[PDB]
Amino acid sequence: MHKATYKERAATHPSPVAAKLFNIMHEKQTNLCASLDVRTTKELLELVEALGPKICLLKTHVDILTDFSMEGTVKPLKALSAKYNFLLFEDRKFADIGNTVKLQYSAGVYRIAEWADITNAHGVVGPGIVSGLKQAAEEVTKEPRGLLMLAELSCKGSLSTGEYTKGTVDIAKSDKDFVIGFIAQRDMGGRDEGYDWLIMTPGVGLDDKGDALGQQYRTVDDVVSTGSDIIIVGRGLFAKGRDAKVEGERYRKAGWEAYLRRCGQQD
Amino acid sequence: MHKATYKERAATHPSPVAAKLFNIMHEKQTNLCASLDVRTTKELLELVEALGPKICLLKTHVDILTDFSMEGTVKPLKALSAKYNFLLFEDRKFADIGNTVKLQYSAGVYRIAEWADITNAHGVVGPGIVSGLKQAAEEVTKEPRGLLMLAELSCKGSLSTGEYTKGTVDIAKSDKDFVIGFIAQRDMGGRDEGYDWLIMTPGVGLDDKGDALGQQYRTVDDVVSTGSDIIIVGRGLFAKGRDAKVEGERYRKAGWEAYLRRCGQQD
Ligand SMILES: O=c1cc(O)n([C@@H]2O[C@H](COP(=O)(O)O)[C@@H](O)[C@H]2O)c(=O)[nH]1
Numbered sequence: 001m002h003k004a005t006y007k008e009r010a011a012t013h014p015s016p017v018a019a020k021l022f023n024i025m026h027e028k029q030t031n032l033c034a035s036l037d038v039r040t041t042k043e044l045l046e047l048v049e050a051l052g053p054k055i056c057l058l059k060t061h062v063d064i065l066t067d068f069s070m071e072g073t074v075k076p077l078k079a080l081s082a083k084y085n086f087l088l089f090e091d092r093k094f095a096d097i098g099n100t101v102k103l104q105y106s107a108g109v110y111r112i113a114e115w116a117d118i119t120n121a122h123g124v125v126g127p128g129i130v131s132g133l134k135q136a137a138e139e140v141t142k143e144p145r146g147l148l149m150l151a152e153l154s155c156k157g158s159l160s161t162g163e164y165t166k167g168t169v170d171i172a173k174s175d176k177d178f179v180i181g182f183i184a185q186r187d188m189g190g191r192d193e194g195y196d197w198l199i200m201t202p203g204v205g206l207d208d209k210g211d212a213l214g215q216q217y218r219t220v221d222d223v224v225s226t227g228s229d230i231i232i233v234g235r236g237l238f239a240k241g242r243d244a245k246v247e248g249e250r251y252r253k254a255g256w257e258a259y260l261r262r263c264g265q266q267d
Numbered sequence: 268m269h270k271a272t273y274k275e276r277a278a279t280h281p282s283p284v285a286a287k288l289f290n291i292m293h294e295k296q297t298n299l300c301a302s303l304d305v306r307t308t309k310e311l312l313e314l315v316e317a318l319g320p321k322i323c324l325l326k327t328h329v330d331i332l333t334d335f336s337m338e339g340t341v342k343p344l345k346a347l348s349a350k351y352n353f354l355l356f357e358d359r360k361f362a363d364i365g366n367t368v369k370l371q372y373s374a375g376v377y378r379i380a381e382w383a384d385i386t387n388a389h390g391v392v393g394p395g396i397v398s399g400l401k402q403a404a405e406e407v408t409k410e411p412r413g414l415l416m417l418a419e420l421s422c423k424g425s426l427s428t429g430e431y432t433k434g435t436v437d438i439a440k441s442d443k444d445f446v447i448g449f450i451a452q453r454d455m456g457g458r459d460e461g462y463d464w465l466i467m468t469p470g471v472g473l474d475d476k477g478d479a480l481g482q483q484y485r486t487v488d489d490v491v492s493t494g495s496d497i498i499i500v501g502r503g504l505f506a507k508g509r510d511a512k513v514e515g516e517r518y519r520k521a522g523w524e525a526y527l528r529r530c531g532q533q534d
Pocket residue numbers: 035037061091152153154155183202203204215232233234235236363364367
C-alpha cells in the first residue's frame with residue numbers, strides 16, 4: 001500500500017505541477033505545506049519569508065486579506081516562491097456553475113488563475129467545474145495549472161461522506177493532467193486505474209486539539225501513515241504566540257521522518 | 268401543499284430579513300430576484316438601476332467584479348437598495364472551516380457581512396459553518412443578517428443529491444432566526460416542524476435552455492409550481508442583447524402570476 005518515493009513520482013506524474021512539487025519535496029526534504037492564514041499582507045509575507053525554506057507548498061486564502069493587491073501581495077509572493085522554491089496554492093474552493101467559477105477564477109480582483117500554480121474545487125457542482133476552471137486558466141495563462149478536489153474535510157460535521165466523496169473522486173478521474181489529486185484525510189486509491197493522486201491533508205497539529213468553530217487536528221504521524229503526501233498546517237505554525245520559524249522546521253522534520261518511515265513499509 | 272401568501276408569512280416569519288423580503292414582494296408584487304452577473308461596477312449599477320423597481324432582491328457576485336470597491340460598489344448598491352426597495356444577497360457560497368469562513372465573510376476586501384442582508388453556504392462543511400458565519404456577522408454589525416443553505420444546484424452533474432441535500436437541510440434547522448431557507452430547485456418541506464423555509468431557485472429562464480458550461484434552465488411557471496418563492500434570473504434578463512428593463516417587467520410579471528395561480532391551489 002505504501003507509495004513510491006517522491007523523486008520517483010516526479011518522473012512518473014503526468015502533471016508538470018505535481019512533478020515539480022514532488023521534486024521540491026525531494027530537493028528540500030519536506031512534505032509540509034504552510035497555510036499562513038493572516039489578515040494582512042505584511043505579516044503574510046513575513047511568515048512566508050520565515051517558512052520559505054522549510055515548505056514545499058504555500059496554501060493561501062487571499063480573500064481573508066484586508067489589504068490585497070496584485071502588486072503588494074501577488075508580486076511579492078511570486079518572488080518568495082521563486083526565491084525559496086515552493087509552489088502557490090490558492091485555497092479558494094470554487095463551488096458554483098462552470099460559468100460563474102470561470103470568472104471568479106480567471107479574473108475578478110484576485111485574478112487567481114494568473115499566479116496560483118494550484119487551486120481546488122468542491123465536488124458538489126458536478127464535473128463541469130473541472131472544465132470551467134481548466135478553460136478559465138488556459139484563457140489567461142500558458143503556465144501549468146493543477147486542480148485538487150475536496151474529497152473529505154477535517155471539521156466536525158463534514159458532509160463529504162462516502163457517497164459525496166465518491167462522486168467527487170469521480171470528477172477527478174476526468175482529467176489526469178489537470179487534476180493532481182485531492183484534499184482528503186486519507187489515501188483515495190486510484191493507483192489501480194493509473195492515477196498518482198496527490199493527497200494533501202489539512203487539520204494537522206502536534207499541539208492543538210482544535211475546534212473553537214469546528215476544527216479538529218490529527219498528528220503529523222497520524223495523517224501520514226493514513227497515506228498523506230503533504231501536511232497542511234496553519235495555526236499550528238504561527239498562532240498562539242508560536243514561532244513560525246521553529247514550528248516550520250519542527251513540523252517539516254516530523255513530517256519527513258513519518259514519510260521515510262512509511263516508505264520502509266511493505267504492508 | 269400550497270403556501271400562505273407573502274403578506275402572511277411576513278407577519279409569521281421569525282427572521283426580520285425574511286419578513287421584510289416577504290413585505291417587499293407583496294408591496295411591489297415581485298418574487299423576482301435579479302442576478303446581474305457582469306464584470307464591472309459601472310454596468311452592474313446600470314442594470315440595477317433598470318431592474319430596481321421590478322425586483323425584491325438583488326443577488327450579487329462581487330468577486331466577479333474587476334473593479335470592486337467599498338465606496339464605488341457597495342455604497343451605490345446600498346443606495347439603490349434603499350431607493351428602489353429590495354434586499355442585497357451576496358451569493359458567495361461559503362464553504363470552508365468555520366474559522367476560515369468567519370474571516371472571509373466579515374472582513375477581507377469585500378467585507379460582505381457589512382452590507383449583504385443575505386448570503387449562503389454549502390452544507391458540505393458541517394453545521395459549524397452556520398455558527399461561523401452567524402458569529403462573523405454579529406461581530407461586525409448590529410444589522411439583521413440571513414443565511415440561505417444550498418440544498419440543490421441547477422447545473423448538470425450536481426452532487427447536491429438526496430443524502431447531501433438531507434444533511435444540508437439539517438444544518439438549516441439549527442437556527443430558525445438566522446437560516447431563512449434554501450437555494451433549491453424544489454420545496455424543501457419543514458412546515459410540519461414550524462419552518463417557513465424561503466425557497467429561492469436559480470437556473471430560471473423563459474428563453475435559454477442553458478449550458479455552455481453546465482447550466483440548465485427551467486421556466487418561471489415550471490419552478491414556481493415546484494414551490495419556489497423567489498426566481499433568480501441572470502443572463503435571461505441582461506445577456507444575449509436583451510433589454511434588462513423589458514425582461515425585468517416580463518419575468519417579474521410571469522413570476523407573480525405563476526404565484527397567484529399556485530395560491531388558488533388547494534391540492
Ligand atoms: O478539510 C479541510 C479543508 C481545508 O482546505 N482546511 C483549511 O486548512 C487551513 C489551515 O488550518 P489550520 O489553521 O486549522 O491549521 C485553513 O485555511 C482551512 O480553511 C481545513 O482545515 N479542513
